[model samples]
Target: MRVYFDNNATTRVDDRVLEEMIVFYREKYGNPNSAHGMGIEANLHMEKAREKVAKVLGVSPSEIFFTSCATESINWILKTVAETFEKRKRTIITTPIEHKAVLETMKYLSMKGFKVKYVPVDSRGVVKLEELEKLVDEDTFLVSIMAANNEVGTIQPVEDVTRIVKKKNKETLVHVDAVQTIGKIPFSLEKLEVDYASFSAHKFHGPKGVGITYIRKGVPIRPLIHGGGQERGLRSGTQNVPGIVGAARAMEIAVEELSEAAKHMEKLRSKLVSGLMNLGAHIITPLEISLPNTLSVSFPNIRGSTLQNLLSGYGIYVSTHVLDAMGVDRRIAQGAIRISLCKYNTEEEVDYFLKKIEEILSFL
Candidate 1:
């Protein structure tokens, strides 16, 4: 009867994905890089998984590079690009609302003499395309942007933004952190024409240790980890066979059922948002521009942490803030709470959570 709604942070592994992973761990246990028969079997599984992921993203199988997680993938792309263009066009552009992975990477690059410029976002957390257009210049080496804002669930105009970047400077590499948006939203990498895109498997009902980074064919960049020359020498380490296989299965299922899932979650979000608004909570996410599964709201005169704690006592769990960006002042960023949904969630769960909130707010 407990309701769990903090999917933006992470998600419970799907039963089917877990079953697939167990088969890999028990039956197909071999290092993918070895030359033995067992190794060949493992390598075959890895290659098929790569192709599955490529089909989901509309990219070639050779372009898919598996990594530890989205964080490492982001680090690899940013650092590789910075090193590739060392002392030449070291400028990078991103937005203010990017996840900590992108923000911290940009900050690190800044210390290494890379000029990092963050485009401003509106109060609703949508980045301004006009500002991004003005920021790109001849010396810019890469433009790293998230496909969507994690905390606010604001989907960025990635297609339009990439078009502007490419039109202005065809030589500049474009990277998109599609961690939060990949399985939840329908996307085609061919349409975006981005140089690189990152995705975490856990966001889409797969295991946590696996992630994917799509490096466009002919994009010149050095590898971050070099050892066995795997993943086209871009990310070099023994392939995580079980995690990769599980991720591929999860992606296949997600993409196949995405439209039905989106419709179900959108109704839950609408209910959550409308009900919370009636209870005097200020809805922070713009309904028209946000993701279908996220509902971020602020309750005046009460800290989000406090509200989350109260809800937790009733077996209803939620997040105080998305991505831990809430400030310590309690008055500024601490008033917001995020309620995220996934396809696994049910209407009964939503009703139970709303009832708990209504009870708690009545006392407040």
Candidate 2:
């Protein structure tokens, strides 16, 4: 049996979602932009999918724009919002530990005369709120922060961070890189009170190449693509009817089981964390503030890639990546092992992985 633990990268689409998409692809395939019967059927299906997405965000369908993925939506926001400001507010606030999508976008903005202030995170990968509050000023045109750290699973104080940004200057837009937290956590865009947020459907057992971007009403949006006025002109293109509908069905299930899922994941996560720690592994994700389904750690004197390859030999599939902070790789010389769980995981699987970890470490 294949024991796969690298869920932070992506997940297998739910069977329910898969079946719906297969049917859509087979029979109701049509251009959502066209007004023919088949097109209308596809369009209606697209809107129904949007409604499910909106339900996840607790927002209206009008506020949500569909895009290829979170990366495209993020690119649109960073560039569009940066251009919206007229030179005075050129500073952008973000953390160093965000996903590459936002980090790379911020880097490009720096070359375009946008001042970027990176708020530092603690050793456990949690952002320092005090440092963040110090960075937001009148010159700050936008604040981009993720709800959770993708690699380490560190949950951020997003609401508090947004509150500080709003209090400092209402004009300073807030953008949440909520890719990791989308279906795993329970949240409301209406209550979050952020100007923008991005999510990928694949993270929630939905289709790949499909995503949602939440734009608060009155937030000026500049389209990255110019074409046949689709997605209310905010994101223009033909819709992915199959993927959209699948994502909606997947999200509906995720939302329904949010609480129960959390408890299951939390329990399994504790077991994984404890067993790994008992093996003398160093934990990077703080237990107090982290996603219940993730653990980032590393073994002493062993690169995570090395451990990952070894584990694969034993029918275990895990991933290796950057070890938290920028440039920390040199001194620590350790790569990250990210073990992310979901609704489908079980305690038995966790036990088998933990047992195998000991054997893997021994061989190493």
lDDT of model 1 at position 363: 78
Q: Model-by-model lDDT, in order?
A: 0.85, 0.84
Instruction: List TM-score per model, in order.
Output: 0.96, 0.95
Could you list the CA RMSD of all candidates, in the order they appear? 2.2, 1.7
lDDT of 1: 0.85
Query: In lDDT terms, which candidate is top?
Result: 1
lDDT of 2 at 278: 93
Writing each residue's lDDT as its tens digit, candidate 2 over 19-138 gives 899978889998888889988989989998889888867988888888999999999999998888856578999998888899999899999888999998777777788888888888
User: Candidate 1: TM-score?
Assistant: 0.96
Residues 1-364, candidate 1: write the lDDT tens digits: 7888988888888899899889778898988888999989999989999999899888899899999999999999999888989867779998777888988988999998899998777666777888888999999989998888777788889988889998889999999999887557887897788999999999889889998888998886787898889887778887889999999899888888999999999998888887888889887777888889988888888889999999989988788723233222345356788888899899898888888899998777
Model 1 alpha-carbon miss at residue 269, Å:
0.8
- Output the worst ten-in-a-row residue range by lDDT, candidate 1: 321-330
